[PDB]
């Protein structure tokens, strides 16, 4: 039992009913999926992704990630149609919360300049996305057994129908903001 999941339906599921006058417990939001991708655009040269893009996201998340291929060819990026350029993984259910806890407690408050992150980074549904500068200090990786550093960005998909309700959901889980 992940401790952020038991924290979810205990009082936060009770919290939003006071805030909006709903008529069913099905209309209350729930985070459904969290998507992580590197997007290694440098990987179109020299193929530094084998011990470079699969393994580093593996220890951060827990499962082997999907290597993605490019939809069409672009000349200026030196990138064909079908070359590996991005590395995606997906987190559902009981592994999703154990990434949401361990991000927001031992990784995400290792991010400086405490305005939190931006609460203006929602899309129009209630879906968030933030970024990371380098291979962060998710302490599962080590700096002496890696190649070059590489950032990522992390999507979070919810059942929200508007942004502030999606902001009301994701604030109460461990995402700092201003």
């Amino acid at each position: 039992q992940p401790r952020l999941k038991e924290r979810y339906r205990s009082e936060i599921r009770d919290a939003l009913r006071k805030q909006f006058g709903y008529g069913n417990v099905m209309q209350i939001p729930t985070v459904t999926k969290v998507v992580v991708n590197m997007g290694v655009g440098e990987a179109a040269r020299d193929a530094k992704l084998i011990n470079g893009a699969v393994n580093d996201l593996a220890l951060i998340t827990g499962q082997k990630p999907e290597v993605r291929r490019a939809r069409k060819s672009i000349a200026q990026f030196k990138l064909r149609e079908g070359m590996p350029v991005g590395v995606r993984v997906t987190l559902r259910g009981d592994r999703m919360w154990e990434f949401l806890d361990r991000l927001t407690s031992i990784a995400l408050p290792r991010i400086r300049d405490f305005r939190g992150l931006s609460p203006k980074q929602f899309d129009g549904v209630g879906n968030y996305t933030f970024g990371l500068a380098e291979q962060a200090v998710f302490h599962e990786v080590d700096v002496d057994k890696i190649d070059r550093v590489r950032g990522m960005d992390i999507n979070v998909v919810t059942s929200a129908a508007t942004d502030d309700e999606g902001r009301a959901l994701l604030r109460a889980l461990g995402f700092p903001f201003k």
């Binding site: 179109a44 040269r45 020299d46 193929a47 030196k78 064909r80 070359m83």
Partner: protein, 62 residues
């Protein structure tokens, strides 16, 4: 090693051609043996294209 010491230094980057020629895989062709299937390779920390790099060693066209 067993005993002794091999002092290296951080002013050296290694390139090693070998007697066993084990980097060559006898199942795949010349454009994948050296260029790993992609199109632009790093050689001198620069952007030299793959087909134009293997052609510098004689392997061209067919």
């Amino acid at each position: 090693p067993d005993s002794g010491s091999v002092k290296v230094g951080e002013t050296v980057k290694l390139s090693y051609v070998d007697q066993a020629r084990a980097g060559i895989d006898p199942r795949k062709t010349v454009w994948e043996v050296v260029s790993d299937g992609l199109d632009y390779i790093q050689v001198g920390q620069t952007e030299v294209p793959s087909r134009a790099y293997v052609s510098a060693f004689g392997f061209k066209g067919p």
